[PDB]
Design a protein around this nucleic acid. Structure first.
Ligand SMILES: Nc1ncnc2c1ncn2[C@H]1C[C@H](O)[C@@H](COP(=O)(O)OP(=O)(O)OP(=O)(O)O)O1
Ligand SMILES: [Mg+2]
Length: 373
DNA sequence: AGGACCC
DNA sequence: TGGGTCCT
């Protein structure tokens, strides 16, 4: 083990794609999916007209006074489709990592080897790429690594083909030697296409970023910390002092994101498997009297119970989270965790009050069934 | 419990 | 600004 062939699959405007399959009349027409006062996602037709994801419904219609909107506050169908995609990819190779509802990582390393071993000392020269090659780099058919990434692009092509035939879904794929690069290159040719990255082009891809914040792994926070240090470009981070950085973010985060700035990411593809938790949420115009407004909570449990059930396993912990309006609390949530009565495990009534007492001990309300077994 | 990070 | 995951 040493050289991996990873693939990053990223579905195009996933929610719109599901809504469109539902009611076809929505195709070719600018379609935006709405949650409260936001247009979380939209089909490309609409993006052409200026609709950008996570855009105010207003800023959205006064940019495209024709945009069709559907409500996407209920993630049931999306979720269901998200697992259908993951499963299909699990077929090609079991080790699949989900990143949100629309992303998956697959370690194709073992699969590329098996395929290569079936090729004869001739046909191995007829190996061809499938899709784009980043920075239009030249392929060297004698470079074993090149042969491997190209095979990976074929498999990548196959998965994309299967997704569309079997599930009616289009999307992108990125093939590289680690998760960071694969995710970075999957977006190069945006609408429903695929790109493969050859080693020689790693820095080019890394340096094409305009801000460290663009590097998967570096969030909103870490970015601001780095700024406060005069670290703005990816090369600033590459050339910055190991000591100082290590001494201000933690030898961990430090040593890790600096490897990242170079295109280095040794993290494995974790097998996601079944969810580690189930939760429903609900935001509402500061509309909760601090009581009686727990009929909403009864609502959450309704669906959740239907979900936690279906799964098969049973959760051994419940939780409640809340919010409070006032100033601009850029981060403010509160939750009361608690074990679930063994008897009650094996129905609403009990639970209802269970959350109620958890309620009292304490704009948005959400229940979460975690600790599954 | 709460934090960071991701989509 | 509707869900999730893993670390402190
Ligand atoms: N539901 C969400 N809530 C908050 N932030 C989000 C959400 N989804 C994505 N983001 C963040 C992640 C990134 O910082 C950025 C979005 O990247 P992204 O939306 O995937 O680009 P995109 O043009 O490819 O959209 P899409 O994948 O729908 O086609 O916003
Ligand atoms: Mg996206």
């Amino acid at each position: 083990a040493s050289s991996r062939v990873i693939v990053h699959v990223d579905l195009d405007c996933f929610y719109a794609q599901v809504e469109m399959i539902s009611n076809p009349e929505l195709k070719d027409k600018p379609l935006g999916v709405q949650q409260k006062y936001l247009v979380v996602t939209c089909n490309y037709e609409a993006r052409k007209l200026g609709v950008k994801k996570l855009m105010n419904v207003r800023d959205a219609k006064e940019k495209c006074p024709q945009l069709v909107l559907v409500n996407g506050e209920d993630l049931t169908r999306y979720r269901e489709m998200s697992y259908k995609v993951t499963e299909l990819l699990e077929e090609f190779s079991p080790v699949v990592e989900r990143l949100g509802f629309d992303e998956n990582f697959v370690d194709l390393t073992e699969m590329v080897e098996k395929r290569l071993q079936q090729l004869q000392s001739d046909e191995l020269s007829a190996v061809t790429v499938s899709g784009h090659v980043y920075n239009n780099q030249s392929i060297n058919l004698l470079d074993v690594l090149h042969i491997r990434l190209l095979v990976g692009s074929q498999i990548a092509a196959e998965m994309r083909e299967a997704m569309y035939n079997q599930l009616g879904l289009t999307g992108c794929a990125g093939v590289a030697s680690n998760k960071l690069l694969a995710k970075l290159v999957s977006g190069v040719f945006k609408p429903n296409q695929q790109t493969v990255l050859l080693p020689e082009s790693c820095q080019h891809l890394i340096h094409s970023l305009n801000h460290i914040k663009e590097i998967p792994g570096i969030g909103y926070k870490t970015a601001k910390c780095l700024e406060a240090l005069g670290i703005n470009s990816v090369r600033d981070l590459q050339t910055f002092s190991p000591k100082i950085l290590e001494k201000e973010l933690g030898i961990s985060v430090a040593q890790r994101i600096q490897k990242l700035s170079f295109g280095e990411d040794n993290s494995p593809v974790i097998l996601s498997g079944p969810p580690q938790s189930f939760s429903e949420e609900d935001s509402f115009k500061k509309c909760s009297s601090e009581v009686e407004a727990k009929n909403k909570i009864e609502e959450l449990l309704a669906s959740l119970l239907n979900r936690v059930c279906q799964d098969g396993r049973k959760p051994h912990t419940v939780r409640l989270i809340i919010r409070r309006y006032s100033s601009e609390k850029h981060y403010g949530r509160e939750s009361r965790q608690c074990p679930i009565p063994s008897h009650v495990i094996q129905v609403m009534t009990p639970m209802v009050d269970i959350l109620m007492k958890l309620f009292r001990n304490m704009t948005l309300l959400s229940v979460c069934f975690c600790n599954l077994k």
